[PDB]
Design a protein around this ligand. Structure first.
Ligand SMILES: CCCCCCCCCCCCCCCCCC(=O)OC[C@H](CO[C@@H]1O[C@H](CO[C@H]2O[C@H](CO)[C@H](O)[C@H](O)[C@H]2O)[C@H](O)[C@H](O)[C@H]1O)OC(=O)CCCCCCCCCCCCCCCCC
Ligand code: CLA
Ligand SMILES: CC(C)=CCC/C(C)=C/CC/C(C)=C\CC/C(C)=C/CC/C(C)=C/CC/C(C)=C/CC/C(C)=C/CC/C(C)=C/CC/C(C)=C/CC1=CC(=O)C(C)=C(C)C1=O
Ligand SMILES: CCCCCCCCCCCCCCCCCC(=O)OC[C@H](CO[C@@H]1O[C@H](CO)[C@H](O)[C@H](O)[C@H]1O)OC(=O)CCCCCCCCCCCCCCCCC
Ligand SMILES: CCCCCCCCCCCCCCCC(=O)OC[C@H](CO[C@@H]1O[C@H](CS(=O)(=O)O)[C@@H](O)[C@H](O)[C@H]1O)OC(=O)CCCCCCCCCCCCCCC
Ligand SMILES: CCCCCCCCCCCCCCCC(=O)OC[C@H](COP(=O)(O)OC[C@@H](O)CO)OC(=O)CCCCCCCCCCCCCCC
Ligand SMILES: CCCCCCCCCCCCCCCC(=O)OC[C@H](COP(=O)(O)OC[C@@H](O)CO)OC(=O)CCCCCCCCCCCCCCC
Ligand SMILES: CCCCCCCCCCCCCCCC(=O)OC[C@H](COP(=O)(O)OC[C@@H](O)CO)OC(=O)CCCCCCCCCCCCCCC
Ligand SMILES: CC1=C(/C=C/C(C)=C/C=C/C(C)=C/C=C/C=C(C)/C=C/C=C(C)/C=C/C2=C(C)CCCC2(C)C)C(C)(C)CCC1
Ligand SMILES: CCCCCCCCCCCCO[C@@H]1O[C@H](CO)[C@@H](O[C@H]2O[C@H](CO)[C@@H](O)[C@H](O)[C@H]2O)[C@H](O)[C@H]1O
Ligand SMILES: CCCCCCCCCCCCO[C@@H]1O[C@H](CO)[C@@H](O[C@H]2O[C@H](CO)[C@@H](O)[C@H](O)[C@H]2O)[C@H](O)[C@H]1O
Ligand SMILES: CCCCCCCCCCCCO[C@@H]1O[C@H](CO)[C@@H](O[C@H]2O[C@H](CO)[C@@H](O)[C@H](O)[C@H]2O)[C@H](O)[C@H]1O
Ligand SMILES: CCCCCCCS[C@@H]1O[C@H](CO)[C@@H](O)[C@H](O)[C@H]1O
Ligand SMILES: CCCCCCCS[C@@H]1O[C@H](CO)[C@@H](O)[C@H](O)[C@H]1O
Ligand code: OEX
Ligand SMILES: [Ca+2]
Ligand SMILES: [Cl-]
Ligand SMILES: [Cl-]
Ligand SMILES: [Fe+2]
Ligand SMILES: [Mg+2]
Lengths: 342, 33, 81, 34, 38, 37, 334, 63, 34, 36, 36, 30, 34, 37, 30
């Protein structure tokens, strides 16, 4: 019969403005704390003791330069719980030690779990297939590989991305100079999936909007659609002929078309995640050995591949002393790699 | 250039094995009914 | 269609603005005072502009020990005074 | 800490002011539920 | 002995139990008060 | 021997052949540089 | 009719397997020329003195490259923006050393791709369609113009155009970051929102339509056979899809109008990529990303670094190392 | 279907498809064991992580 | 006759209440001098 | 119920957004974060 | 080189003339609906 | 052997384009 | 041993190409209407 | 367009598959030593 | 790699024997 579990199930699944669900018990606290943690840190909290950086509006940063920065390298991979052995329950010290970083990363991870459970739960209630939850596995693979696996393979959370606009840009440039990440075929597949997904988004939207049937008298054509109508609002047959004659091939099956729109960006993000798992271990696509053997013996042999390595060497030497303060690097002027004049 | 000597057969089997899988499946579809 | 009162009804009502002409400025002023009194610095441990360095030091106070990190920060802070 | 009360009193007076205006309609909403 | 971090572990465990217990107590209470009509 | 009632015919249409060969060939064009190294 | 009329009727014929059209009569020869030169150069061109310092860079497969490292290399900095067709060289050997193939390829490509866009207008007209697919294509097309023509014009040399190759592309990006701080430029940030968002909405729309396909097939066949080309009824239940997505977020955050939805799918990536293209095209005139180097200062005046200052250190490493033999004077002014 | 000597011996082990205990059955007991298991995984995780540090437990090669 | 306090009301104020407080704090910061 | 027209609420709210964002851009040139 | 230059100039002129005279050859009327 | 391999794969792709376009399964209104 | 470095791919394709030819022909015979 | 009346189905029975694979594999076992040399 | 190749071909031949004998097309009197 209707026990307390079923009575609770009733209330959780009420059709209200913001659906709750069983998944909401996990999703809403964790999403709220991750977002609230980020807003709290970027507004008020420094990175002076972990990075030697200002990182909050309170210190004078703007929206592009605020961040919640990773903990000091000496923390290792500490969970850095507020009640843990590092902060010992002291909220102020916890903030100064980087506790908001693991707070956001961990509540964010469980919030993402809660969101994907929500996608399953709602799909089951309204009676649709759960492909939206399936497609969301790609955001999850990215978050887990970049914010958890990658630093877990490295020396500490310090080398995870810090949560901020400019901080993420630094992460990109670090990956170029140290990992040569642009050369990695798993990143290249990710790029193809993202740009190919954006291409499909644009071309499908434009094709539908330009093969519409005239279903009203208005020159603005949005009102000539009824959600309950049975008929296609655009001509698949005309769309197919156009693209066949323009590009050589065209979709003819709308079910395949829309599955392909799931497949392409979702697969790309999954591939990029695999490459980052490799970079967790410094298992890079850094070099082509045949190129290096030839270049070492032949000082006239030059390609764009060898040119980019010189850029990477500059990035490493010029950014490492300030970007890795725990190493206490001191690079005398005379050892810095530089071309002529610059 | 001093390339990896297994790269040629790696690339050749990488192409051939899944391609022939697909060709086998395609041709036996055409021959049905 | 979900039973709650429509937002456009709420925010065009006199009672909404009787309440929120007080609560919205009150919160804004509370946030202002959180900074202007300096309390924000002490809650979160953020350096004031005169508290990044002692007068002659030029080395950042980087935490270097995981389990005595709390005492290290405390020592860093004592060296400012 | 005087600063805590200085910051919280604006919000305290706001919550107090909102309850005063919405109280008759609040007890009416809750009375309907039970 | 019970180290400071084992004490901390117990505090964290109790805090999570309290957060979860209060959450479900409130949800169960509301669900019983505002039942769906069939 | 009595036949198995669970058997099913398998199909691959021409478009799927073309899509699959494109995937394989492009993956090969991409990864071959790294196989030769 | 007369031969000119029959010719015009064939050119503009809606029955050709691939549409030709008047834009097509320019597109077809120019794209064939660019393709053929590109393929031959990518395989067999000798090294090119891209930076005008008699330091030739090898781009082709036969001269030591693989697919990832190979490129058609931009024309020499000594040429600058000068027009360098084959007949301006004393010999093909000279033409090749100075990067002649690059100019031939990008100029034929840009012309052909512009006609590709016009051809998309033209066929839509012949088929009785609405006309704006070509406007969506203007976003990638404008981006190609930005990296192959506008950036060279602003910097004064086709040697600074994007190379025609995979690693050459990365070289262009890294040098661009060093010289313009493009990551800190809001038009590039809008570009990222455009392509991240485009990929997101692609996956979203794909997943939502796929989730609400109407049952027309059995467990042992592809659900794709439930749709037949040219059927009049919609193949998925948009009311169910909206009922799902509106509960995922909230009701009014979801599209119930398919025309509105597909307009949004077109507009978001197209507008974002327009701003990407305009980012490159305005950094072409050295209006660069935000510079917050030493923006945060303490009470004494000590610099307090932010993440922007760490970006700056990385940019410096790129700056001091790029084109390591090309600069004689202390400032890189183009 | 084919009977065999071994199949006849094993038949009772594959004869109760679909059999269930009424209602919630042992679910409450199961939940308790799940909760204990969660705490167990949290303990061993925090020991490995050096977030939980116990006397005589040196999480190091120097164990 | 509509309810006043709902789940939606709670969700709205968990976001709106801190947002206005934070915006007042960031406003004050614009007048801080080193 | 509906005594205050929605277009006035939107106009006043929108002007408030412009004022606060304008203040934040002012602060980019003065005090902390100004480089001065 | 001079022969190459002349040849390309003639080729380009040929295709450009096709483009211009083609679009002058009653192009608005080349649609499936109202021709005018 | 590397160059032959790269050019061979590329040539197969171009041939595939030809067949995918001119010898496609024709779209038919059902 | 210093073997011919093409012997491996020569042997592999010698087996694979005609074997695959026969498998293709066999499987499409089995799938024909009986 | 009208279909070509000269088309014929092709067959390879199972025994011919086994005979052919035996021929190929034994030829490979024979010639492989000379390919490696 | 040579030895692997020889042993692989041999192993394929033995597998072929198994299929040719136990998975032959059965002879049937018509
Ligand atoms: C799909 C996703 C679905 C949904 C995802 C939901 C996410 C939930 C959140 C999970 C959080 C996991 C936190 C793991 C923390 C960690 O690992 O913390 C790390 C600790 C190990 O501690 C590290 O140990 C290192 C090695 O030390 C050792 O060696 C030293 C040098 O000799 C000394 O001798 C020292 O005493 C000795 O301990 C260093 O000391 C580091 O500073 C220290 O941080 O392991 C541990 O706690 C436990 C390690 C064993 C279990 C690991 C399983 C989980 C991680 C899997 C990923 C592996 C990544 C590998 C890279 C690829
Ligand atoms: C679904 C909601 C949810 C989830 C999944 C999490 C999850 C997490 N929180 Mg968050 N949090 C939440 C809501 C949530 N939180 C809410 C509502 C608040 C405001 C109060 C917070 C405030 C908060 C803070 C301040 C911190 C966390 C932290 C954490 C992390 C460590 C938690 C831990 O070790 O607890 C362990 C406890 C349990 C797993 C409970 C298990 C209960 C068992 C099954 C029952 C047995 C209880 C037992 C009988 C009690 C005996 C005690 C006795 C022996 C002494 C973890 C990622 C920490 C962090 O992020 O570090 C960086 C941290 O510092 N949370
Ligand atoms: C332990 C404790 C305390 C537990 C308490 C649990 C409990 C009871 C909680 C109750 C909840 C509560 C009281 C408070 C909640 C707290 C809170 C505020 C949490 C915050 C969570 C949070 C920050 C969420 C942010 C996520 C969010 C809203 C993102 C919005 C993203 C966004 C831009 C959305 C929509 C914009 C838009 C135009 C999208 C269109 C995209 C698109 C093209 C879709 C394609 C498409 C669309 C269609 O539409 C249909 C049709 C089809 C075909 C189709 O292709
Ligand atoms: C009312 C209900 C509202 C509900 C909101 C729910 C929470 C989510 C809020 C997310 C906001 C994130 C941006 C905050 C920016 C900020 O406060 O800057 C605050 C800073 C403050 O300005 C800084 O203040 C310092 C004070 O010492 C210094 O003076 C600095 O020099 C100065 O720059 O303002 C700026 O940087 C100006 C530009 C801000 C505009 C940012 C737009 C970016 C939008 C990107 C998309 C994100 C999605 C958001 C959608 C909503
Ligand atoms: C330090 C510990 C930190 C963690 C603690 C976590 C504890 C809280 C977790 C759960 C929070 C849920 C809040 C929602 C409560 C609510 O306002 O709706 C419940 C109803 C809604 O009214 C009703 O609203 C109903 C619609 S709806 O359900 O709100 O959508 C409508 O049906 C009805 O007629 C109307 O009267 O009102 C109440 O009865 C409030 C009860 C007290 C709630 C305290 C929170
Ligand atoms: C810049 C213009 C943006 C609109 C064009 C978007 C790209 C086109 C994509 C490919 C064709 C896609 C396509 O075919 O679109 C078709 C779509 C519907 O066509 P209709 O024929 O119904 O209406 C257009 C005209 O015929 C007038 O009725 O066009 C529009 O909705 C135009 C909306 C303009 C609204 C006002 C103009 C400016 C709005 C700015 C939008 C946001 C800008 C802020 C960003 C910071
Ligand atoms: C002016 C003329 C311009 C012509 C240029 C030549 C265009 C070539 C277009 C691709 C042809 C090959 C397509 C094979 C595959 C094929 O035949 O697909 C045909 C297929 C038709 O789909 P249908 O909807 O008809 O199929 C539905 C069901 O049959 C599915 O089972 O089209 C798509 O799936 C579109 C999505 C894939 C689009 C892939 C685009 C790839 C672009 C090229 C990327 C690689 C470049 C490598 C360079 C080295
Ligand atoms: C349904 C067709 C809609 C047509 C327009 C479609 C445009 C495309 C949608 C993009 C715009 C998005 C903004 C909609 C804007 C829009 O369309 O406005 C219309 C909408 C309706 O307002 P009304 O006054 O009609 O309210 C009536 C309802 O409340 C009665 O049930 O206004 C809002 O929803 C305000 C949103 C406040 C929401 C705050 C709630 C915070 C809760 C946080 C949790 C969120 C979900 C958590 C899950 C992670
Ligand atoms: C961490 C933590 C926690 C939590 C807390 C929280 C939950 C908070 C929240 C907070 C919040 C919730 C906040 C908010 C804020 C907001 C803001 C600050 C906003 C701003 C905005 C703006 C500024 C806007 C802008 C714009 C845009 C975006 C677009 C359009 C236009 C404009 C430009 C206007 C606890 C206690 C549990 C524990 C400890 C730790
Ligand atoms: C760059 C050099 C070119 C500069 C040219 C400047 C234009 C000055 C006048 C040129 C007029 C060209 O002449 C143009 O071509 C032929 C010649 O009968 C005509 O012929 C065309 O007529 C009809 C119009 O419905 C078409 O359907 C038909 O297929 C086509 O043959 C065009 O109707 C005429 O307009
Ligand atoms: C080195 C790479 C090697 C990769 C090798 C890959 C091997 C792939 C083997 C595919 C096997 C196909 O299996 C084949 O399926 C078809 C249907 O699809 C079956 O065919 C059956 O169904 C069809 C269609 O209704 C009937 O016309 C036919 O009479 C019936 O026998 C065949 O009896 C079976 O032999
Ligand atoms: C790297 C090595 C690659 C080697 C590749 C070798 C390719 C070999 C291609 C074999 C082509 C077989 O060609 C295939 O023949 C069958 C009959 O046999 C035809 O099938 C036709 O006849 C059969 C049998 O009556 C009918 O059931 C079927 O409906 C009809 O279409 C197919 O339409 C055709 O596709
Ligand atoms: C935490 C939720 C998962 C555990 C659910 C266990 C339910 S336990 C179950 O509950 C019924 C009421 O719901 C009672 O009537 C019944 O007697 C009891 O056995
Ligand atoms: C389609 C390719 C056309 C290329 C024509 C180039 C031929 S160039 C060649 O060499 C000399 C240059 O003037 C002349 O003496 C000679 O007549 C000329 O044919
Ligand atoms: O050429 Mn390519 O890169 Ca445009 O900056 Mn100046 O120049 Mn060179 O240096 Mn940096
Ligand atoms: Ca001062
Ligand atoms: Cl360079
Ligand atoms: Cl110079
Ligand atoms: Fe669609
Ligand atoms: Mg300021």
């Amino acid at each position: 019969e209707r026990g307390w579990f079923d009575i609770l199930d009733d209330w959780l699944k009420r059709d209200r403005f913001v659906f709750v669900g069983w998944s909401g018990i996990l999703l809403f606290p964790c999403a709220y704390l991750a977002l609230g943690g980020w807003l709290t840190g970027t507004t008020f909290v420094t990175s002076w003791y972990t990075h030697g950086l200002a990182s909050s509006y309170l210190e004078g940063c703007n929206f592009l330069t605020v961040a919640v920065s990773t903990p000091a390298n000496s923390m290792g991979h500490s969970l850095l719980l507020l009640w843990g052995p590092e902060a010992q329950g002291d909220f102020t010290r916890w903030c100064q030690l980087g506790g908001l970083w693991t707070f956001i990363a961990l509540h964010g991870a469980f919030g993402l779990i809660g969101f994907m459970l929500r996608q399953f739960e709602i799909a089951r209630l309204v009676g649709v297939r759960p492909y939206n939850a399936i497609a969301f596995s790609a955001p999850i693979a990215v978050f887990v590989s970049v914010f958890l696996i990658y630093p877990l393979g490295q020396s500490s959370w310090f080398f995870a991305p810090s949560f901020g606009v400019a901080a993420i840009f630094r992460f990109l440039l670090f990956f170029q100079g140290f990992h040569n990440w642009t050369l990695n075929p798993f990143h290249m597949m990710g790029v193809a999936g993202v740009l190919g997904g954006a291409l499909l988004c644009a071309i499908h939207g434009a094709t539908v909007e330009n093969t519409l049937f005239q279903d009203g008298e208005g020159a603005s054509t949005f009102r000539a659609f009824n959600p309950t109508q049975a008929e296609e609002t655009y001509s698949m047959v005309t769309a197919n002929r156009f693209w066949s004659q323009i590009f050589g091939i065209a979709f003819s099956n709308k079910r395949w078309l829309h599955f392909f729109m799931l497949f392409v960006p979702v697969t790309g993000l999954w591939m990029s995640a695999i490459g980052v798992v490799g970079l967790a271990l410094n298992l890079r696509s850094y070099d082509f050995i045949s190129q290096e053997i030839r270049a070492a013996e032949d000082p006239e042999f030059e390609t764009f591949y060898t040119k980019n390595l010189l850029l990477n060497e500059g990035i490493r030497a010029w950014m490492a002393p300030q970007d890795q303060p725990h190493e206490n690097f001191v690079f005398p002027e005379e050892v810095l790699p530089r071309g002529n004049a610059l | 250039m001093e390339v990896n000597q297994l790269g040629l057969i790696a690339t050749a089997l990488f192409v051939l094995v899944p391609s022939v899988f697909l060709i086998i499946l395609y041709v036996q579809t055409e021959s049905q009914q | 269609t979900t039973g709650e009162r429509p937002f456009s009804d709420i925010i065009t009502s006199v009672r909404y603005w009787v309440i929120h002409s007080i609560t919205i400025p009150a919160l804004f002023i509370a946030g202002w005072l959180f900074v202007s009194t300096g309390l924000a610095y002490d809650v979160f441990g953020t350096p004031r502009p005169d508290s990044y360095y002692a007068q002659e030091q030029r080395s950042i106070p980087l935490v270097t020990d995981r389990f005595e990190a709390k005492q290290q920060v405390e020592t860093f802070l004592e060296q400012l005074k | 800490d005087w600063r805590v009360l200085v910051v919280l009193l604006p919000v305290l007076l706001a919550a107090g002011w909102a309850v005063r205006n919405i109280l008759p309609y609040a007890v009416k909403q809750v009375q309907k539920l039970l | 002995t019970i180290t400071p971090s084992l004490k901390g572990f117990f505090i964290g465990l109790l805090s999570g139990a309290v957060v979860l217990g209060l959450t479900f107590a409130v949800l169960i209470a509301i669900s019983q008060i505002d039942k769906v009509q069939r | 021997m009595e036949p198995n009632p669970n058997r099913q015919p398998v199909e691959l249409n021409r478009t799927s052949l073309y899509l699959g060969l494109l995937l394989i060939l492009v993956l090969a064009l991409l990864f071959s540089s790294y196989f030769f190294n | 009719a007369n031969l000119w009329e029959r010719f015009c009727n064939w050119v503009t014929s809606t029955d050709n397997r691939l549409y030709v059209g008047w834009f097509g009569v320019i597109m077809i020869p120019t794209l064939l020329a660019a393709t053929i030169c590109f393929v031959i150069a990518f395989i067999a061109a000798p090294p090119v003195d891209i930076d005008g310092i008699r330091e030739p860079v090898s781009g082709s497969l036969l001269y030591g490259n693989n697919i990832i490292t190979g490129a058609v290399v931009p024309s020499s900095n000594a040429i600058g923006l000068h027009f360098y067709p084959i007949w301006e060289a004393a010999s093909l050997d000279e033409w090749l050393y100075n990067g002649g193939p690059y100019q031939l390829i990008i100029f034929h490509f840009l012309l052909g791709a512009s006609c590709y866009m016009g051809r998309q207008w033209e066929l839509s007209y012949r088929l009785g369609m609405r006309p704006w697919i070509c406007v969506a294509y203007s976003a990638p097309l404008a981006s190609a113009f930005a990296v192959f023509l506008i950036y060279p014009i602003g910097q004064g040399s086709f040697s600074d155009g994007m190379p025609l190759g995979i690693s050459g592309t990365f070289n262009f990006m890294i040098v661009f970051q060093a010289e313009h701080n493009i990551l800190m430029h809001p038009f590039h940030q809008l570009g990222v929102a455009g392509v991240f968002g485009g990929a997101l909405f692609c996956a979203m729309h794909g997943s939502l339509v796929t989730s609400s396909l109407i049952r027309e097939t059995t467990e042992t066949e592809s659900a794709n056979y439930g749709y037949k080309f040219g059927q009049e009824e919609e193949t998925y239940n948009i009311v169910a899809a909206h009922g799902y997505f509106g509960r995922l977020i909230f009701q009014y955050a979801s599209f119930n109008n398919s025309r509105s939805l597909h307009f949004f799918l077109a507009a978001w990536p197209v507008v974002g990529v327009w701003f990407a293209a305009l980012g490159i095209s305005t950094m072409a005139f050295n209006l660069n990303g935000f510079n917050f180097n030493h923006s945060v200062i303490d009470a004494k005046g000590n610099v307090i670094n932010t993440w922007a200052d760490i970006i700056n250190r990385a940019n410096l490493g790129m700056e001091v190392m790029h084109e390591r033999n090309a600069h004689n004077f202390p400032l890189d002014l183009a | 279907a084919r009977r065999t000597w071994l199949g006849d011996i094993l038949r009772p082990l594959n004869s109760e498809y679909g059999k269930v205990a009424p209602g919630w059955g042992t679910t409450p007991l199961m939940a308790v064991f799940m909760g204990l298991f969660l705490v167990f995984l949290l303990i061993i995780l925090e020991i490995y992580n050096s977030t939980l540090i116990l006397d005589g437990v040196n999480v190091s090669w120097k164990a | 006759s509509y309810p006043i306090f709902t789940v939606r009301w709670v969700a709205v104020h968990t976001l709106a209440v801190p947002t206005i407080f934070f915006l007042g704090a960031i406003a004050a910061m614009q007048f801080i001098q080193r | 119920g509906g005594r205050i027209p929605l277009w006035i609420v939107a106009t006043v709210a929108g002007m408030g957004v412009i004022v606060i964002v304008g203040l934040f851009f002012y602060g980019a040139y003065a005090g902390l974060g100004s480089s001065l | 080189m001079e022969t190459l230059k002349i040849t390309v100039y003639i080729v380009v002129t040929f295709f450009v003339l096709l483009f211009v005279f083609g679009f002058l050859s009653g192009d608005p009327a080349r649609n499936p609906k109202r021709k005018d | 052997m590397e160059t032959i391999t790269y050019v061979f794969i590329f040539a197969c792709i171009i041939a595939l384009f030809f067949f995918a376009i001119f010898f496609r399964e024709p779209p038919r209104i059902t």
